[PDB]
Amino acid sequence: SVPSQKTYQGSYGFRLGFLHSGTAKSVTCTYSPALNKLFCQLAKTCPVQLWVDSTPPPGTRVRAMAIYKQSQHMTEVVRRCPHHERCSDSDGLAPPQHLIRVEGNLRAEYLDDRNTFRHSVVVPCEPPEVGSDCTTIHYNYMCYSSCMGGMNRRPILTIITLEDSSGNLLGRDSFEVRVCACPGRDRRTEEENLRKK
Numbered sequence: 001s002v003p004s005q006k007t008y009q010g011s012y013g014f015r016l017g018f019l020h021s022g023t024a025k026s027v028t029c030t031y032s033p034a035l036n037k038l039f040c041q042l043a044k045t046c047p048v049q050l051w052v053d054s055t056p057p058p059g060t061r062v063r064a065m066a067i068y069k070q071s072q073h074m075t076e077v078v079r080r081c082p083h084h085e086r087c088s089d090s091d092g093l094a095p096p097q098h099l100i101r102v103e104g105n106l107r108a109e110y111l112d113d114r115n116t117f118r119h120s121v122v123v124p125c126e127p128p129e130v131g132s133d134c135t136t137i138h139y140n141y142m143c144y145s146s147c148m149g150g151m152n153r154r155p156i157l158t159i160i161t162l163e164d165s166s167g168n169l170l171g172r173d174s175f176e177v178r179v180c181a182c183p184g185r186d187r188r189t190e191e192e193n194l195r196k197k
């Protein structure tokens with residue numbers, strides 16, 4: 001009733017990577033290594049790099065799913081709030097209830113799990129373009145952390161899993177997410193709080 005969040009590189013040495021976008025007031029997405037936490041604006045591009053030490057087999061896929069970070073909320077499905085699920089901002093593929101979308105990939109598939117009711121979005125693994133050493137997926141988060149009746153100020157994690165063609169686990173990584181109006185200021189504030197402690 002709770003998906004695992006244990007980091008697992010697996011046989012292919014799978015792990016995530018993030019750009020270094022800084023903390024200017026205008027930044028739309030920024031990652032804090034000290035907090036392992038991504039800060040982003042609503043419905044803005046979040047580039048997440050995928051790194052491996054060796055090439056996984058054809059048919060390998062990469063799935064993203066959100067869970068609540070606090071244990072007392074972890075069994076609750078993370079979903080969009082009562083406002084955003086009804087705002088008709090569909091891209092034609094993502095169900096309106098799903099918090100996480102993949103941008104610009106027509107092969108993305110959206111799952112409502114028939115047993116857990118949790119949402120996820122999964123894409124095929126594709127090799128890096130010539131001249132690149134990693135592959136990047138562009139995610140969007142479609143509600144604010146503060147949305148009433150949805151996340152309601154509760155922190156979430158995103159779990160990224162590398163899976164075989166049957167859905168079996170090959171690798172796992174994760175990061176906390178805050179969706180907020182000013183990611184640069186919030187990253188600076190939270191990193192300062194961590195330092196003061």
Ligand SMILES: OCc1cc(I)c(-n2cccc2)c(I)c1O
Nearest residue numbers: 050051052055125126127134135
């Ligand atoms: O052949 C090299 C290579 C192949 C693949 I397929 C991937 N990959 C794409 C999504 C997940 C892993 C990567 I990163 C890579 O470097």
Ligand SMILES: [Zn+2]
Nearest residue numbers: 081084143147
């Ligand atoms: Zn919302």
